[PDB]
Design a protein around this ligand. Sequence first.
Ligand SMILES: CC(=O)N[C@H]1[C@@H](O[C@H]2[C@@H](O)[C@@H](CO)O[C@@H](O[C@@H]3[C@@H](O)[C@H](O)O[C@H](CO)[C@@H]3O)[C@@H]2NC(C)=O)O[C@H](CO)[C@H](O)[C@@H]1O
Length: 141
Amino acid sequence: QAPYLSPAVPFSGTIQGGLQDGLQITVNGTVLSSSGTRFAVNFQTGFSGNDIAFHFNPRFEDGGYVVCNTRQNGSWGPEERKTHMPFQKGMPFDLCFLVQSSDFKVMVNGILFVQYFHRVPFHRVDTISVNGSVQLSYISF
Ligand SMILES: CC(=O)N[C@H]1[C@@H](O[C@H]2[C@@H](O)[C@@H](CO)O[C@@H](O[C@@H]3[C@@H](O)[C@H](O)O[C@H](CO)[C@@H]3O)[C@@H]2NC(C)=O)O[C@H](CO)[C@H](O)[C@@H]1O
């Protein structure tokens, strides 16, 4: 699939073919300095953000941590929290999501950061959405 170049945030874009085992999705952008304390990348079903298979949610709060969660029919599940922050306000990042049979493997600037075990079927995902305190250079596949 051709990349999305400099899309405005908040952004929502189709993942052509849906999520597939071995698919790699890169989000390349910059964390904003004066526009809040959180962003998220959502792997979701269509345009209701009510069904989000994987919400990846860095928070520049409390020393910095990342929330990983799933939303179903509007309701957020129990969070998994990673109490390390690999991003920095005002710095560019390369964020890579690799779909695997049982989990997502998430890399930041080339280094494995977290794995998120599938809670819902990943083949149901057809949309990536990004919002909060970031600007995007590209999303690629
Ligand atoms: C960045 C983003 O996508 N924000 C939208 C999203 O925000 C939710 C979501 O990140 C869930 C994930 O579990 O967490 C909510 O945060 C709360 C805390 O603020 C709360 O006080 O503690 C809770 C744990 O006990 C939880 O972590 C977060 N909500 C808010 C208000 O920030 O979804 C929202 C709608 O639910 C809204 O769309 C945000 O914009």
